[PDB]
Structure formats: C-alpha cells, structure tokens
C-alpha cells in the first residue's frame, strides 16, 4: 500500500504476532485450574490481546514486514488519525495549558505580593483561568493582534551584545 | 374586583368589558403571560376555522359535491384527509389559506402595534354592521358561536375517532 507496507488485516506477520502472543498466555494458562483467580486473570489478558489485534486489523493501519503497525505521518488524510488528528487534540490541550498559565501569571503580577500567588495559588481565580482555556485560539489570536501578547523589543531586558 | 365567571377568583387584570365575549374568564392567568391582542386574534382565528369546520362536518354529512364520492371512499371527517392529500384538494386549500395567512401574519403584527382591532379584516361586502349596536351585538354572537364551534369540532372529530359515524349519522343512529 503506502510506502510498500501492507494493511495489518491481511499481513501474515501480524497474524503470527497475534497467534504467538496468545500462545504465550495460553501456556501460562495451561498450569492453572479453571475457576482459580490466576486462570481468570490470564484469560482476561488473552481477551484483551485478541481485542487489540482485532481492532488494529480493521483500523486501516499499515503493518511492516515485522508485523507491527506503522504510522504514516506525511499529512495524508487516509492516515490522519495517527498523527494529524491526535496532534490537533494535543495542540488544543497544550495551548489551553499555556493560555491558562499565561493568564494566571498576568493576574499574579497585579497582586499585592506577586510571588506569593505563584507558591500559594489563588485557587478560585486559577480555576476561573483553567475554565478560560476552551477558546484559547480565538482568545490568544485576539490577544496577539490587539498588542497584548507580544511586548515590543525595547521592553525586554537583553545582554549588552 | 372579583371574576364574574369564577367568583372565588380575582379579575384577570388584562381583560375588560370593551372586549368581545368577555366574561372575566381567565382563571389560569394566560393573559398575563402573553399579549392579550395576540390571544384575542388567536381566539378569533380558532373560532372562525372551527366554525367553518363545524359547518363543514354538518354539510359533508348532508350532501356532497358532484363527483367527489369517487375520489374519496366511504371515508368521512379526518378519514378524507389522507386521500384528498393524494389528489391536490388539500394541497390547494393549504396553498391558498397559507397565502391568506402570510397577510394574516402582517395583520397580526399590525394588531400587536395597536393599529387594528384583532380579527378586524374590514370584510363587510353585504351590509350588516352599519349600526353600532348591531356591530357590537354581532361581534358578541361571533365570539360565542365560535367558542361553541371549537368545542363542537372537538366533539365531532372525537365522535368520528370513536364511532366513525359523523355528526348527522351519529344523530340518526345511537
């Protein structure tokens, strides 16, 4: 398929991975009696292993010659659920954390003693700020354009060189 | 000040005897919630549609226009609606009543502004409301007959939903 890879649902090496992974657990299950707590635990592990391989086979992942799933991250939309979409979820959460922390340090600067607000956090105000993060791309872009994100170069301390 | 219709309840503080069909009957205080002019217009719109429906049930039981017995079956009242939707009868009635009610929407907004009495479409081709006494008397007759017609319309259609007979045929049989 893509990059000479094979879909995991029809690769024989993924199937032998699943079969070997289940044989390892079945030989551990072969030393226990049916209703015992270790046997029940081992059987649930076998069920989880089968579910993982069954889900991966039908997911559109591409396996290598080694039978392990490979991620295609060049931007193609048939594989966007492996990096582009998880990455968009990350950048939303990361920008949330960044916007929320930036808003709290700007609040803490306007305090009576700014450095106590950073070792003893004003938790109601900081929770107001953690609620602010859900619309950070718009809040931060309006902040950027309204001249409130970027400070001018002549307001920043720099070394003599 | 206590209600003429419900003596243990207060006057509904939005209704006055200058209205048509006033009896002091607003126990649930719906007139406070929504504009009385809208409610008056709505009452009269319900009254006139149900009046036409009541006369229609009676007349449909009495006689039937030429040719109609073929298109409908032995269906009557709500029964004819599903079949006359197939032909364009209900489609054309809907189209032209919808066309009138677009202007009825504009008229209702004029009533909300206060530039017109509710239900006053100035429709008097034949002369009946020349005299003022007759005009108020006929506005009271219209509202009372309309409220009765609405109740009657509910009765006739539910009598169809029970027996399938229709008004005149439920009088003749049982």
């Amino acid at each position: 398929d893509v990059a000479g890879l094979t879909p995991c649902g029809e690769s024989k090496e993924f199937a032998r991975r699943l079969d070997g992974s289940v044989k390892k657990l079945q030989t551990r299950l072969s030393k226990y009696e049916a209703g015992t707590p270790p046997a029940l635990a081992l059987q649930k592990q076998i069920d989880k292993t089968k579910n993982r391989f069954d889900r991966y086979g039908k997911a559109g992942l591409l396996c290598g010659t080694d039978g392990l799933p490979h991620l295609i991250t060049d931007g193609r939309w048939t594989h966007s659920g492996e990096f582009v979409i998880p990455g968009l979820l990350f950048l939303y959460v990361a920008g949330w954390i960044g916007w929320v922390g930036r808003s709290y340090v700007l609040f803490a600067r306007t305090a009576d003693k700014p450095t106590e607000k950073e070792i003893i956090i004003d938790v109601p105000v900081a929770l107001s700020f953690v609620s602010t993060g859900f619309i950070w791309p718009f809040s931060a872009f309006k902040e950027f354009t309204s001249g409130n994100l970027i400070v001018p170069a002549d307001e920043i301390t720099v070394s003599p060189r | 000040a206590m209600s003429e219709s419900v003596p243990f309840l207060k006057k509904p503080e939005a209704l006055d005897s200058s209205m048509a069909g006033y009896a002091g009957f607003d126990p649930l205080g719906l007139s406070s919630i929504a504009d009385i002019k809208f409610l008056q217009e709505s009452e009269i719109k319900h009254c006139r549609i149900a009046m036409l429906a009541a006369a229609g049930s009676i007349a449909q039981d009495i006689f039937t226009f030429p040719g109609v017995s073929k298109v409908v079956g032995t269906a009557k009242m709500t029964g004819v609606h599903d079949v006359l939707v197939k032909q364009g009868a209900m489609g054309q009635i809907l189209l032209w009543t919808s066309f009138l009610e677009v202007f009825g929407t504009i008229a209702l907004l004029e009533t909300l502004d206060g530039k017109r009495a509710p239900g006053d479409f100035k429709f008097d081709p034949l002369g009946f409301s020349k005299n003022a006494e007759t005009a108020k008397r006929y506005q009271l007759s219209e509202i009372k007959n309309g409220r009765l017609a609405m109740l009657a319309t509910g009765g006739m259609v539910h009598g169809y939903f029970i027996t399938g007979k229709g008004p005149l045929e439920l009088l003749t049989n049982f």
């Binding site: 993982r52 998880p86 070792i119 956090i121 | -």
Partner: protein
C-alpha cells in the same frame, strides 16, 4: 473549614501533586476503559 488549612492546600507542592495525580488518574482510567489507543479511530 479553616482558612489557613485551605491556604496550605493552595500551596504549590500540594496543588502540583493533587493536580498531577488527578491528571494521572484520568489517564489511567481512560486507558482502563479504552485501552490500546495507538491512533485516533477513523
């Protein structure tokens, strides 16, 4: 509840440990009910 004990629970190490334990706790719970999420499923 005492205001000095609440001001103690607002200190940086307590909030850091509680918030990262809560964070760790919903990563653990999300990987418990919905394990083996190598990809966004689509």
């Amino acid at each position: 509840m005492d205001s000095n004990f609440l001001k103690y629970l607002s200190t940086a190490p307590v909030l850091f440990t509680v918030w990262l334990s809560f964070t760790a706790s919903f990563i653990i719970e999300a990987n418990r009910f919905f394990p083996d999420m190598l990809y966004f499923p689509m």
